[PDB]
Design a protein around this nucleic acid. Structure first.
Length: 113
RNA sequence: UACCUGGUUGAUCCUGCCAGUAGCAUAUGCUUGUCUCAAAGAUUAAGCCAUGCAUGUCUAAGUACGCACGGCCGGUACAGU
Protein backbone atom coordinates (compact mmCIF):
# COMPACT_ATOMS: atom_id res chain seq x y z
CA UNK A 1 0.00 0.00 0.00
CA UNK A 2 1.45 3.25 -1.24
CA UNK A 3 0.50 6.74 -0.13
CA UNK A 4 1.46 10.37 -0.41
CA UNK A 5 3.70 12.82 1.42
CA UNK A 6 1.59 15.68 2.79
CA UNK A 7 -0.39 16.62 -0.31
CA UNK A 8 -2.02 15.17 -3.40
CA UNK A 9 -1.40 15.45 -7.12
CA UNK A 10 -2.26 11.83 -7.99
CA UNK A 11 -0.29 8.58 -8.23
CA UNK A 12 1.21 7.56 -4.84
CA UNK A 13 5.00 7.62 -4.66
CA UNK A 14 5.96 6.60 -1.14
CA UNK A 15 4.82 4.72 1.98
CA UNK A 16 1.52 5.60 3.68
CA UNK A 17 2.80 5.69 7.26
CA UNK A 18 5.98 5.22 9.24
CA UNK A 19 6.28 1.51 9.97
CA UNK A 20 8.91 -0.96 11.11
CA UNK A 21 9.58 -4.68 10.78
CA UNK A 22 11.89 -6.89 12.81
CA UNK A 23 13.59 -10.23 12.23
CA UNK A 24 15.79 -11.28 15.18
CA UNK A 25 17.69 -8.09 16.18
CA UNK A 26 17.52 -6.45 12.79
CA UNK A 27 14.87 -3.86 12.19
CA UNK A 28 14.14 -1.22 9.61
CA UNK A 29 12.29 2.06 10.03
CA UNK A 30 10.66 2.91 6.69
CA UNK A 31 9.93 6.67 6.89
CA UNK A 32 7.87 8.55 4.19
CA UNK A 33 9.69 10.99 1.90
CA UNK A 34 8.79 13.74 -0.62
CA UNK A 35 8.89 13.22 -4.40
CA UNK A 36 12.11 12.82 -6.35
CA UNK A 37 14.41 12.09 -3.38
CA UNK A 38 14.88 8.50 -4.59
CA UNK A 39 15.25 5.46 -2.36
CA UNK A 40 17.84 6.27 0.29
CA UNK A 41 18.76 2.90 1.73
CA UNK A 42 21.47 0.22 1.79
CA UNK A 43 21.91 -2.02 -1.31
CA UNK A 44 19.79 -4.92 0.06
CA UNK A 45 16.36 -3.20 0.75
CA UNK A 46 16.92 -0.94 -2.32
CA UNK A 47 16.12 -4.01 -4.46
CA UNK A 48 12.82 -4.82 -2.76
CA UNK A 49 11.47 -1.27 -2.35
CA UNK A 50 12.32 -0.42 -6.00
CA UNK A 51 10.42 -3.48 -7.26
CA UNK A 52 7.52 -2.55 -4.96
CA UNK A 53 7.12 0.77 -6.81
CA UNK A 54 7.94 2.67 -3.63
CA UNK A 55 10.17 5.22 -5.28
CA UNK A 56 10.84 7.54 -2.36
CA UNK A 57 11.71 6.49 1.16
CA UNK A 58 14.01 7.28 4.07
CA UNK A 59 15.25 4.34 6.13
CA UNK A 60 17.56 3.51 9.00
CA UNK A 61 18.73 0.15 10.28
CA UNK A 62 19.59 -1.14 13.72
CA UNK A 63 21.61 -4.21 14.62
CA UNK A 64 23.62 -6.78 12.68
CA UNK A 65 22.79 -6.19 9.00
CA UNK A 66 25.85 -8.22 7.91
CA UNK A 67 23.78 -11.42 8.06
CA UNK A 68 21.54 -10.29 5.20
CA UNK A 69 19.00 -13.14 5.55
CA UNK A 70 17.63 -11.30 8.60
CA UNK A 71 17.98 -7.90 6.92
CA UNK A 72 15.84 -8.71 3.87
CA UNK A 73 13.22 -10.71 5.78
CA UNK A 74 12.91 -7.72 8.16
CA UNK A 75 12.43 -5.38 5.18
CA UNK A 76 9.80 -7.74 3.73
CA UNK A 77 8.17 -7.82 7.22
CA UNK A 78 7.88 -4.01 7.14
CA UNK A 79 6.47 -3.96 3.59
CA UNK A 80 3.73 -6.42 4.72
CA UNK A 81 2.45 -4.16 7.53
CA UNK A 82 1.22 -1.44 5.13
CA UNK A 83 -2.30 -2.95 4.72
CA UNK A 84 -2.25 -4.10 8.36
CA UNK A 85 -1.88 -0.53 9.65
CA UNK A 86 -5.15 1.23 10.43
CA UNK A 87 -5.61 4.73 9.06
CA UNK A 88 -8.59 7.13 9.37
CA UNK A 89 -9.53 6.42 5.72
CA UNK A 90 -10.45 2.82 6.57
CA UNK A 91 -12.68 3.68 9.56
CA UNK A 92 -15.91 3.40 7.54
CA UNK A 93 -17.36 -0.08 7.90
CA UNK A 94 -17.15 -2.87 5.31
CA UNK A 95 -20.22 -4.38 3.63
CA UNK A 96 -19.15 -8.04 4.09
CA UNK A 97 -19.75 -9.18 0.48
CA UNK A 98 -20.19 -12.94 -0.07
CA UNK A 99 -17.20 -15.17 -0.78
CA UNK A 100 -16.21 -16.64 -4.21
CA UNK A 101 -16.12 -20.03 -2.42
CA UNK A 102 -19.84 -19.57 -1.72
CA UNK A 103 -21.11 -18.13 -5.01
CA UNK A 104 -19.19 -20.37 -7.45
CA UNK A 105 -19.85 -23.59 -5.50
CA UNK A 106 -22.34 -24.74 -8.17
CA UNK A 107 -19.61 -25.86 -10.61
CA UNK A 108 -17.77 -27.67 -7.82
CA UNK A 109 -20.61 -30.12 -7.10
CA UNK A 110 -19.47 -32.77 -9.53
CA UNK A 111 -16.60 -34.48 -7.76
CA UNK A 112 -14.35 -31.44 -7.32
CA UNK A 113 -12.34 -30.67 -4.19
C1' U B 1 20.97 11.00 -0.42
C1' A B 2 18.36 10.35 7.40
C1' C B 3 22.64 4.36 3.30
C1' C B 4 26.66 0.80 5.08
C1' U B 5 30.59 -3.59 3.53
C1' G B 6 34.93 -7.33 4.91
C1' G B 7 37.26 -10.11 9.31
C1' U B 8 36.39 -14.75 15.72
C1' U B 9 33.21 -20.79 13.57
C1' G B 10 32.86 -27.24 10.69
C1' A B 11 28.23 -24.31 10.12
C1' U B 12 24.41 -20.60 12.50
C1' C B 13 22.63 -16.37 15.39
C1' C B 14 24.64 -12.40 18.73
C1' U B 15 28.04 -9.10 21.67
C1' G B 16 32.29 -6.23 20.22
C1' C B 17 36.36 -3.96 18.13
C1' C B 18 39.58 -3.71 14.04
C1' A B 19 39.75 -2.68 8.64
C1' G B 20 37.17 -0.61 4.29
C1' U B 21 34.23 4.56 2.86
C1' A B 22 33.43 10.41 2.17
C1' G B 23 34.80 15.62 3.60
C1' C B 24 38.17 19.08 5.63
C1' A B 25 43.97 21.21 6.27
C1' U B 26 49.16 20.69 6.73
C1' A B 27 53.41 18.10 4.98
C1' U B 28 55.28 15.19 0.83
C1' G B 29 55.87 12.12 -4.02
C1' C B 30 54.88 12.05 -9.31
C1' U B 31 52.99 14.86 -13.36
C1' U B 32 51.45 19.66 -15.76
C1' G B 33 48.74 23.31 -22.09
C1' U B 34 45.22 28.01 -21.57
C1' C B 35 42.08 31.56 -18.51
C1' U B 36 40.57 34.38 -13.76
C1' C B 37 40.59 34.92 -8.31
C1' A B 38 45.03 34.66 -4.23
C1' A B 39 46.76 32.16 0.97
C1' A B 40 51.95 32.37 2.17
C1' G B 41 58.30 31.77 8.91
C1' A B 42 51.69 31.13 13.12
C1' U B 43 52.77 25.63 14.58
C1' U B 44 59.34 25.06 16.28
C1' A B 45 62.95 29.56 19.17
C1' A B 46 57.97 36.54 21.92
C1' G B 47 65.55 32.72 19.29
C1' C B 48 69.67 36.19 17.43
C1' C B 49 70.68 39.85 13.78
C1' A B 50 74.96 42.81 8.82
C1' U B 51 73.06 46.55 5.23
C1' G B 52 69.10 49.84 3.05
C1' C B 53 64.56 52.15 3.94
C1' A B 54 59.94 52.72 6.89
C1' U B 55 57.50 60.55 9.99
C1' G B 56 57.71 64.78 8.92
C1' U B 57 55.72 69.74 8.09
C1' C B 58 54.84 77.00 5.10
C1' U B 59 50.53 79.82 3.36
C1' A B 60 48.50 86.58 0.71
C1' A B 61 48.96 85.98 6.34
C1' G B 62 54.82 84.08 13.25
C1' U B 63 60.51 85.50 12.62
C1' A B 64 64.46 86.85 6.14
C1' C B 65 70.65 92.80 6.62
C1' G B 66 72.47 84.09 3.83
C1' C B 67 78.42 88.69 1.68
C1' A B 68 72.31 83.45 -1.94
C1' C B 69 69.66 84.35 -6.94
C1' G B 70 67.37 88.79 -8.19
C1' G B 71 67.04 94.12 -8.68
C1' C B 72 65.90 98.65 -12.66
C1' C B 73 66.58 102.20 -6.64
C1' G B 74 65.06 101.10 -3.00
C1' G B 75 64.22 99.77 2.55
C1' U B 76 61.50 105.01 4.75
C1' A B 77 56.54 97.42 8.35
C1' C B 78 59.28 96.71 3.03
C1' A B 79 60.00 92.91 -2.82
C1' G B 80 60.00 88.81 -6.12
C1' U B 81 62.14 84.11 -5.35
Amino acid sequence: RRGYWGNKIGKPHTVRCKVTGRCGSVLVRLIPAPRGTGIISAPVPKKLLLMAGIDDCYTSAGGCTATLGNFAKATFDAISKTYSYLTPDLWKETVFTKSPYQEFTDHLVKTHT
